[PDB]
Amino acid sequence: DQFLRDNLEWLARATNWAKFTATASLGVIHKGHEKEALQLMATYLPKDTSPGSAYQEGGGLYALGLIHANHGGDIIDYLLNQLKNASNDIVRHGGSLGLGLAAMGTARQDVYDLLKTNLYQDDAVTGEAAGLALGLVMLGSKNAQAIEDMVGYAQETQHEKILRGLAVGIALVMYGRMEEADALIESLCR
Amino acid sequence: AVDTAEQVYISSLALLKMLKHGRAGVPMEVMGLMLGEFVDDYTVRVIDVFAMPQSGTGVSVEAVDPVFQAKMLDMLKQTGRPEMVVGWYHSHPGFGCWLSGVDINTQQSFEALSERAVAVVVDPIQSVKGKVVIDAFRLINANMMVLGHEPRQTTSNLGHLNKPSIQALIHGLNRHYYSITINYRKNELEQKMLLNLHKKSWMEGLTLQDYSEHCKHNESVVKEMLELAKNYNKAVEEEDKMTPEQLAIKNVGKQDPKRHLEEHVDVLMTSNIVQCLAAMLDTVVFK
Amino acid sequence: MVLESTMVCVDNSEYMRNGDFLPTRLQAQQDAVNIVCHSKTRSNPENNVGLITLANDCEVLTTLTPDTGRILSKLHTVQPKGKITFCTGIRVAHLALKHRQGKNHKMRIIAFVGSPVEDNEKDLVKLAKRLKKEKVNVDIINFGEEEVNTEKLTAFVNTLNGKDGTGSHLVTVPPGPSLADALISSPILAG
Amino acid sequence: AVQKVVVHPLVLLSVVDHFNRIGKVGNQKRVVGVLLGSWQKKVLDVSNSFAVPFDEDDKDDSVWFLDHDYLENMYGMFKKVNARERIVGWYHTGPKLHKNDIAINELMKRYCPNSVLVIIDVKPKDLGLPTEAYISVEEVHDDGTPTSKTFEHVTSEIGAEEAEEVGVEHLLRDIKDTTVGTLSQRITNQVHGLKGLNSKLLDIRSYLEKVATGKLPINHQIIYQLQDVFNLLPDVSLQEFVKAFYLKTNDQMVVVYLASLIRSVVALHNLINNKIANRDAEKKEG
Ligand SMILES: [Zn+2]
């Protein structure tokens, strides 16, 4: 990528979620290249230098999640530890998305637990974060307690983003179910 | 500093006090105050609305009575929830509910004290039923002339709020001001019962009385309006039989039709009221 | 200062209309309301004091307020004719104490019993354990004629609180002629 | 006196949102507040209201109190901002009034000559138009007992004026409006009919249950006269009720005759004109 070299003042105009997407494209163009993708970004790494851009450092782990989707490696736990470290909820935005997207289709267990205690941190913009993450890890599993807890957390919460993240979350858990899902589809539609 | 797309969570009690305080002052513009809680920058809620008394100075920053605020918040302390004040509102029944010079003259005071203090205006006149009407205003910071004036991010509620683009003179305030989105939160049980509360109009008063009052009249004296309807039969259909011949002269449709369609079909729907409710007599009279 | 809400209870029983307390118990308990309202005024400004009629029907005419002016107006022409009722007289002031806006004020009741009561010992011990659960401290001052050296009322105050609870004190009228000011002279200095 | 009251959705919600106020903290009893009425005429209208904290012991189920300073200066607040508004009474959420609710009205009779108490319902269930209205009146009795107060029921209706119409009419967003002539009258035939069935059913269930359990009185008084009013009209033919039959048949004559007339007119116009523009569009294009 020459992008940051060819366009500069446009990237200096970036503010708020712009630096999220800016460092998120870093992972879209680096999609694949599983080996050096972590160390090659050291200049663009999710700092966390604290003149807070913090949607920046959230989008950095988002970039690492876009590359690590489907199969993956210890970088998944590398993002998991950083989810348990640094700040909140700015890390969970793209970080938990990285944790859930990398475990997508793998039917990961501990992610469902540590995302429940992460879901209880009670914020708004992180609503879509844990919702899409928990929906990706459970893809095709058609589990029970996962949808039960996602539909049980939607009451006391005041945010509509946790409703939409859990909307696609309980939507993504069921794939190719045909008439098997219609039992829940009747309740969701009614 | 940081700016993000804003959403105003409103309570039905707030909107009720809004239009009620605005309807009692028509034509004269009144002055209220908004009550609620600031959760964060990108979301805000108004959980209550109370009205300020009208004074001789008119609508002005001095119209707010400090001893009224002290005694009201004390009356809110003995009330269940004593939430802190947030912002102000004033109704504009007589015109298109645009902020005047005094509205900004009190806005630098409300932005001084309170960080946000969103300004809301409401009018009964625009729509009698099917529109939110009301209005929304927030004063942009003049100290931001250095940086850019065009946030936010997550443009969803923003680009959808701008439309219609709200005329010219209103969006003439889009310079130095900007609107804010309003959504109705449920609270579905109360929204459903209050839904049926106004449905008592077109359904029935008790859901029993008014169409048992249609069992009171019940063709009474409802045939008098059938005699006027059959006079509309003779009237409208004697000129309706002149239409198809003229259609053969002018060859053919003048676009048209005169309409001069439907109508007494509804009179026959009252005949469905005739057959049904009179068939109830067999149930009423026998046991 | 100490935080609490004191609810004074005048005795409207028909036995309280006699002039044994000079010149009359009406003005005697009026001065009793005078000394309790002025002492609580000299105690804390945040103390609000209402009145309650114990005998016959229990109704508080003056909503709980720090100003005793309306209370002093109800002391006149009160028409205190009726049969003394005890069990309800404490609970009616307890409901008036649950209407307080501020919850930092302790619940306190002062009442005057000048008449023999038919209240059974089972009723006062049920109110005693009920006030134990509700923490309410009641300081009663016995006026008028009653059972000599009142027992069920003394056992009511005893069993009302404990450990310490510092506390509920009962002041009974001595068996001798005295002014009402001399009867209230002891409680105002020490409870 | 007071015949009927007009209860706007604003006052009802003003009680129910206070049922959220003290309902989040709970627990038992009911939401009681001061009712602000508007009297233009014998028909009563309601616009605004305000609620006051209230507690009632059970011990002592007859003990009740309100904050008069809240009633005083807030009335001074609401009368200030609006000079047309004044208190016509109080209200509570019931659902069924306990015998102690009388003395509340007797205390505020000094504020208003006649205070009408409005029972309301925070959770809609049955059977129909919610809440209730009771006016304070002394009817004595036909038995000459010392005068006692049994509140007479005032019929309550829901209405609005202008802005209160604007808010709720946009807030429905639920069912078709109306629609006039088709679904409207027949759904009302279901509701008013069936809710009239279970009304008198459960009410006649109380008629027999009160005789079975709850005596005395209970029965007397109005039982013998009210039940005979039920026995006023059985009411069947012969004779003149047979004449009303085919007379009603003679009434449906005209309307259904007109129905066939509209059928001929609608079929004539629409079918002829449509086939014209149809055959013409086909023969010209094809
Ligand atoms: Zn103005």
Curated annotation (Swiss-Prot), chain A:
Top-level taxon: Eukaryota
Annotated PC repeat ranges: 21-54, 59-92, 94-128, 129-163, 165-190
Family from the record: Belongs to the proteasome subunit S1 family.
Function, in words: Component of the 26S proteasome, a multiprotein complex involved in the ATP-dependent degradation of ubiquitinated proteins. This complex plays a key role in the maintenance of protein homeostasis by removing misfolded or damaged proteins, which could impair cellular functions, and by removing proteins whose functions are no longer required. Therefore, the proteasome participates in numerous cellular processes, including cell cycle progression, apoptosis, or DNA damage repair.
Oligomer status and interactors: Component of the 19S proteasome regulatory particle complex. The 26S proteasome consists of a 20S core particle (CP) and two 19S regulatory subunits (RP). The regulatory particle is made of a lid composed of 9 subunits, a base containing 6 ATPases and few additional components including PSMD1. Interacts with ADRM1. Interacts with ZFAND1.
Protein name: 26S proteasome non-ATPase regulatory subunit 1
Organism of this sequence: Homo sapiens (Human)
Lineage: Eukaryota, Metazoa, Chordata, Craniata, Vertebrata
Segment of the intact protein contained: 383 to 572 of 953
UniProtKB/Swiss-Prot annotation, chain B:
Coiled-coil residue spans: none
UniProt entry tagged with the keyword Nucleotidyltransferase: no
UniProt-annotated binding residues for Zn(2+): H90, H92, D103
Residues where Phosphothreonine is found: T243
PROSITE patterns from the UniProt entry: MPN
Cited Pfam families: JAB, RPN11_C
Keyword terms: DNA damage, DNA repair, Hydrolase, Metal-binding, Metalloprotease, Phosphoprotein, Protease, Proteasome, Ubl conjugation pathway, Zinc
KW DNA repair (keyword) present: yes
Record-level Gene Ontology MF annotations: endopeptidase activator activity; K63-linked deubiquitinase activity; metal ion binding; metal-dependent deubiquitinase activity; metallopeptidase activity; proteasome binding
Record-listed E.C. numbers: 3.4.19.-
MPN domain boundaries: 8-143
GO CC terms in record: cytosol; cytosolic proteasome complex; extracellular region; ficolin-1-rich granule lumen; nucleoplasm; nucleus; proteasome accessory complex; proteasome complex
Gene Ontology annotations of biological process type: double-strand break repair via homologous recombination; double-strand break repair via nonhomologous end joining; proteasome-mediated ubiquitin-dependent protein catabolic process; protein deubiquitination; protein K63-linked deubiquitination; regulation of proteasomal protein catabolic process; response to ethanol; ubiquitin-dependent protein catabolic process
Residue window of motif JAMM motif: 90-103
InterPro entries, alphabetized: JAMM/MPN+_dom, JAMM_MPN+_peptidase_M67A, MPN, RPN11_C
Name the record gives this protein: 26S proteasome non-ATPase regulatory subunit 14
Protein source organism: Homo sapiens (Human)
UniProtKB/Swiss-Prot annotation, chain C:
This protein's GO CC annotations: cytosol; nucleoplasm; nucleus; proteasome accessory complex; proteasome complex; proteasome regulatory particle, base subcomplex
Single GO MF descriptor: molecular adaptor activity
Superkingdom of origin: Eukaryota
Record's keyword terms, sorted: Isopeptide bond, Phosphoprotein, Proteasome, Repeat, Ubl conjugation
Gene Ontology annotations of biological process type: proteasome-mediated ubiquitin-dependent protein catabolic process
Site of covalent link Glycyl lysine isopeptide (Lys-Gly) (interchain with G-Cter in SUMO2): K122
Transmembrane portions of the chain: none
Residue ranges constituting the VWFA domain according to the UniProt record: 5-188
Protein purpose: Component of the 26S proteasome, a multiprotein complex involved in the ATP-dependent degradation of ubiquitinated proteins. This complex plays a key role in the maintenance of protein homeostasis by removing misfolded or damaged proteins, which could impair cellular functions, and by removing proteins whose functions are no longer required. Therefore, the proteasome participates in numerous cellular processes, including cell cycle progression, apoptosis, or DNA damage repair.
Membership in a protein family: Belongs to the proteasome subunit S5A family.
Comment text on domains: The 2 UIM motifs are involved in the binding to a multi-ubiquitin chain in a cooperative way.
Protein name: 26S proteasome non-ATPase regulatory subunit 4
Native source organism of the sequence: Homo sapiens
Recorded name of the encoding gene: PSMD4
Curated annotation (Swiss-Prot), chain D:
Position of the Glycyl lysine isopeptide (Lys-Gly) (interchain with G-Cter in ubiquitin) cross-link: K176
Highest taxon in the source lineage: Eukaryota
GO molecular function, one term: protein homodimerization activity
PROSITE patterns in UniProt: MPN
Cross-referenced Pfam families: JAB (PF01398), MitMem_reg (PF13012)
Keyword Flavoprotein: no
Cellular component annotations (GO), alphabetically ordered: cytosol; extracellular exosome; extracellular region; ficolin-1-rich granule lumen; membrane; nucleoplasm; nucleus; proteasome complex
Keywords: Acetylation, Isopeptide bond, Proteasome, Ubl conjugation
Keyword Magnesium: no
Gene3D superfamilies referenced in this protein's UniProt entry, alphabetically: Cytidine Deaminase, domain 2
Function: Component of the 26S proteasome, a multiprotein complex involved in the ATP-dependent degradation of ubiquitinated proteins. This complex plays a key role in the maintenance of protein homeostasis by removing misfolded or damaged proteins, which could impair cellular functions, and by removing proteins whose functions are no longer required. Therefore, the proteasome participates in numerous cellular processes, including cell cycle progression, apoptosis, or DNA damage repair.
Leftover remarks: Does not bind a metal ion.
Protein name: 26S proteasome non-ATPase regulatory subunit 7
Organism: Homo sapiens (Human)
Top-level taxonomy: Eukaryota, Metazoa, Chordata, Craniata, Vertebrata
